[PDB]
Amino acid sequence: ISVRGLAGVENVTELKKNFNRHLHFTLVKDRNVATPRDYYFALAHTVRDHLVGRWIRTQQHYYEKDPKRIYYLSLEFYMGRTLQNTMVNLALENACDEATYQLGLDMEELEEIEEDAGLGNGGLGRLAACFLDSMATLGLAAYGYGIRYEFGIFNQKICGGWQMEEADDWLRYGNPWEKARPEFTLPVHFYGRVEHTSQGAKWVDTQVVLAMPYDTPVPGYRNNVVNTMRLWSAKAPGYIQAVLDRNLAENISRVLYPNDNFFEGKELRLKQEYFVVAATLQDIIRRFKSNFDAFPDKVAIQLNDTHPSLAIPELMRVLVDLERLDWDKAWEVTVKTCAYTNHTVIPEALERWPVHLLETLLPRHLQIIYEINQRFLNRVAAAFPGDVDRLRRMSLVEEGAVKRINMAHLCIAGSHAVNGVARIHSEILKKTIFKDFYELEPHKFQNKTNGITPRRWLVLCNPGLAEIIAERIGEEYISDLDQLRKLLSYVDDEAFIRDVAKVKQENKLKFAAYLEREYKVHINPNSLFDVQVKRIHEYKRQLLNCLHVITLYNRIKKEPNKFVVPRTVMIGGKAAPGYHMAKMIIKLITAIGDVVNHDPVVGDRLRVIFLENYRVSLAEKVIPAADLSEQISTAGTEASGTGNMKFMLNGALTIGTMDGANVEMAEEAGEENFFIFGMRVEDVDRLDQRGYNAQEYYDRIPELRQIIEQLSSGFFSPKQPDLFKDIVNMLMHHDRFKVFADYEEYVKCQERVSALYKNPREWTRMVIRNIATSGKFSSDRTIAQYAREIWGVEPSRQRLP
Amino acid sequence: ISVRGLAGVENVTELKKNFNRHLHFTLVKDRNVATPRDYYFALAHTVRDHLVGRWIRTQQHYYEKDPKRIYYLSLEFYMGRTLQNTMVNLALENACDEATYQLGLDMEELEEIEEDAGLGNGGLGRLAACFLDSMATLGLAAYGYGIRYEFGIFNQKICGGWQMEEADDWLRYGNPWEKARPEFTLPVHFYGRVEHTSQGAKWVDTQVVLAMPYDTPVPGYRNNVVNTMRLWSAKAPGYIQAVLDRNLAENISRVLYPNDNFFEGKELRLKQEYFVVAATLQDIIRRFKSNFDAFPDKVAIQLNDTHPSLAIPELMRVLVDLERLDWDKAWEVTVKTCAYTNHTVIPEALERWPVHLLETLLPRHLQIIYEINQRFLNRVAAAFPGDVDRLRRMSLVEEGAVKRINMAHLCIAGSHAVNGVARIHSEILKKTIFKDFYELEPHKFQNKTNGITPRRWLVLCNPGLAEIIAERIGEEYISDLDQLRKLLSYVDDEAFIRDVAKVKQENKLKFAAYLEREYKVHINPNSLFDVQVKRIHEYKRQLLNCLHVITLYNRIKKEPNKFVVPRTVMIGGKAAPGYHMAKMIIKLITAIGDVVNHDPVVGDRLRVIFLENYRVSLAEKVIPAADLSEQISTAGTEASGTGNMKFMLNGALTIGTMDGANVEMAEEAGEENFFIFGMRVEDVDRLDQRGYNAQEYYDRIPELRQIIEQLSSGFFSPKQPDLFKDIVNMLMHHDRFKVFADYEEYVKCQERVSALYKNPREWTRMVIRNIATSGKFSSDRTIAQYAREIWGVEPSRQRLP
């Protein structure tokens, strides 16, 4: 594969040398006792060495050049593995492949040893990871800042068809990429009280929690740029208990909260948020000094959701309390420095911290928040005199049994730019959700449609597809994905049609081999791979997919002799621990497979399997092997989505609603090349207006009725007939996401999917039309937009020495 | 200095190269931002690389050769720093000194950056450290096994004259010597219950705590041998709390219990003891397999006190329960494998675990302990028919309100050899303490007089003394200390007399510079350095030293014009957190200095200072600068001592009682070259027989009376007159260590010390007579004895390729 680079003779000689050097000096092993794991580490250290030169030169270059610096604050960085990605971006894949081969090793076997850096829940976390990659590839002096969770997203195990949660001990064998920096440790304060003296406020009597930075290299695509991702680790500042009690403060960075789009309100989570903000901003203020009028010209702080929103009052605290800037100048600086990115409209995702909890944990911040609110509302009152309810709606403070602070409101008030993550989402922010904020400051609202990196999500996971594409158009598309459009010229090319189809079958055979090897699960390779992989939530409607699967099963039993395109339906994703419904849903999926997968009448004509522990590395295996991409969220619920983009970039056809980025993907490729179905936002609203009555659908659709009765009677749970009563009850009477309402259109749409799959040539030509138009969804495009429209810096693909 | 080795041109070139390589690749720094700390680490990694080749070859050699293996189980390993020691044993000191010099660095400045591996309390821990060094130098296939405490002995701070305890975060900047081995992690079980089936007992329903090994290299003196010290680290095997709760099991290896010679009975301590035993023995059984009749021929398990005593029932558990050996054969194997080393006779040091606590935590072990006891007592009854009280005295089980298990009794019953740590101590074990065990099995009891390593304790800490010695007798003494005897030939050599005196003054100027630099404390360089450094306990009698200091002060005030040899009295050591008296004593020391050090009449004629945070690295600084070594424990209380040996090896004259190894040191050098004083064990016994009445001494000694009244009235605590009432009360009515009884002889003896110090020539000639006869106290001699008399292996100084 030519996109994998050259295997120079000297380069390969040096690689083997250093591989052996590390096995000896770093791992202290001989080839007599060395295990594949040792071999993976020897290679990892060898590859890591290649990053050091550029890593130091890059940061040095930024110091010499002094460009505006971008600080991307996020509570999650879903990075995945680093070995292949590092090799790809440094052009060392083939060389390492050859070197390890000469040493009698299978580099791919070694790559499977690496642990995912799963410091993210799903989309939001992964976007930050793709962003770091694009910001590096775009030559930006960007700094990712987050927290180094000791345990990332829990490793999911399926036991008895039920999800089981296990600690994700990802640092067990160490992390060869990060560089601990105990020397740059900073103090973070909690609790305490405020003293207002003759020099102003003073935050005193606080408990200290030290923040230890760990820096990880972020390589751009072959431009010799290596940026940094800084993750903070919590460190403590009779006798035995006191030493043991050091655990309490160090628990702050222990584990990533596994909630997806759901606000909890745990004090430990709030501490984690402030912890990353306080430390990060100390780093920022100091770097800046090595005056404050030019702060926004040299500093950009991007908030990934409201998680690090505390950076607004924190920046104010620093400038006013410690730097002695007058409130007004400080605020001008703050707003021009901060920008906020909203990721969802679902109300239960919004962060509204009880004022009492903020008053106790961060007394000085609450005071600053109240002051920010007064002046902000004062502005609203001056723009809309007499509009009292607007004041109540716009307020950062929410009244109720428990007074709270709306963090989204704080972010809008404290940032010069606010953006949605897809056109439809960004429009609704201005239309509904923040309509009032939009009317006050229209110029603040923007859109930055999400994207995925073509490196990890194409060249890395699909070397075969990337090769045949390069064969025709060169390698330039790799960091210029819009060039994929030149592929529309091959819709009638018999060679390309053959190859696209060939690559997809190879990926499917590979994924089949993976499942056979790791889980002993056998799937039919000559079946349509229908895949829905994403976090398990009601708004994503894995239940709608379940209804369809059962429909296919019942239709086969009713007319056995009737041919149907064979399908292997794969659903994967994690349910948040404690979310009862999401876990009942995972159980229904395995429960359906228990019947379906063992019916002799059905045989290998239909198979339903649940992909265990869906994570970044699994996404890289299954997505390139998918035929149909399921993106069936209820219209108006999925802000953007990114998994949809990955499936489009990898040769799968999409079946979905006009929601999130699905809309822009259909527009890019042409609605005729997308399997669009069901309600549109407007239709959902009309149902809401008159009230959603699931009974009507049940009453009017005999096939749906049959499935509800099978679930109800215990057809899919013979030993425990009433096992799914809650799913049934929710569907019939408390379904906020109208599953039944899109049932008919969905089943009909799937019929068309099968129809097209029956025609291999047309299936593939439509696929080509999809890949050829996925270009807009590369994160390089998104980041360039952030750079020019929000940060105020010009991106550049120019190489460093 | 010639004992420091050669500075080869190529060697120096390569060192600098690798130093720079590590600064770049390992530390990811440039010389623009590098700090001395970075420089220390760059050198440390560079030096560590030199150990790897031999480390792998040595272990490989032991595998090929298959010699009997020695497993030294200890709960403490007071290692101190590793950089200089590594350089010394590999002959790289001068080369590294030159290399770093050429790089513009002061290697000694860099050495001060290293953190002590203070995983020990005092003597017992340090002996294990010196033993590892000697076992390596003696070519033994020896393996040190312990626990990797996250926090070693607390760092002591003196605040307001009071000791303050701070966590000893020694791994904060990492440990460049150890090699983590997560791949060799083993499971350790706790709690649970026993199931007696048809295949015997089965330990089930236990909670698991994983033991992660960390291996540290142990270099022998220039023989190319590099053994291993294995330290185990505890690892865990709604959702958030469960992840946080992983801390509980990991707390097992968190911090070293700071008690010196005092049994507590904390369950966490018992868990730590079993943790090291279970893991260590798993390693031992496995290694052995890669049959059991030859186990004792291939395995030696040395127990450093009763801390790892659980290895006896644990070995039995393994052989009977898991290996299916009949009880009798298993026991024969066990006893022949285990040997026990007793370190103290003080009753409050003995480990007597409540049976209920053992029954709960290790149910199967208690059962085995009871079975061991029955059969053992059965043997006693058969050897002494009708002697019922002997049975009660020898029993492993102790009756009382709370039934307990005597671990010392378990160790004697389960080992083929039992030894004291000095001749006097070993004799009393046979005479009193274990008189009954001795009568049953006389052949079991031995003596292994302690020793210290001449490498760390001479060549390392006193390069000057080691140089002048080498100038006359060569370097052979370094690993053959008995050769120091050839120095008796220079008692009249004017050159040697000049040089010994010169070296001592250089060490004193250096220690003075240290105190000035680090603590801003100024000491008179032309004063007698009177030093007592050791853990703070009543039996060590720092209080006796205090009484003398006050005597000197009162005598100066009474006769100001009377010349007295100027003295800088230095007392240092840590008091166990919670030991009220030991801490009151530290306060009295600083309290005396507060008066003495500020009396204008006294001036620089007498100074009392408390050396803060006494630890291995401090011992290396102060001992070589000491004139008088204080070893004044009450006769019969200090089993051996090792600090005394260090002072003798380094040119200090000793003032002490006929206790522990003091006795053998006087015998080696000649009592006329030692300042021996006070009661002998026999005299203590007679006082005990009639009852110790401190009042008598108070009544008959006017000078002592004066001091007690000064303490009582508040002369040394004006702001709090009653501050020392407890010390006074204890001395007058509850002194178990008869301080007053040795007061007169002690003050008189100190008078003779001053008399001799007035004659520099004779002082030095007597010193020479001391250094020349310290040879017997090198740990190489002790270990060789252990090897031939207990382990059954022949030591060897032979070099490896």
Ligand SMILES: *Cc1c(COP(=O)(O)O)cnc(C)c1O
């Ligand atoms: C891309 C990605 C996501 C996001 O998928 P959506 O379907 O947009 O929610 C979630 N998890 C992982 C492992 C991903 O790689």
Ligand SMILES: *Cc1c(COP(=O)(O)O)cnc(C)c1O
């Ligand atoms: C040698 C040593 C000891 C033992 O000293 P003694 O006076 O025998 O009790 C204690 N602590 C340290 C730091 C040592 O080096």
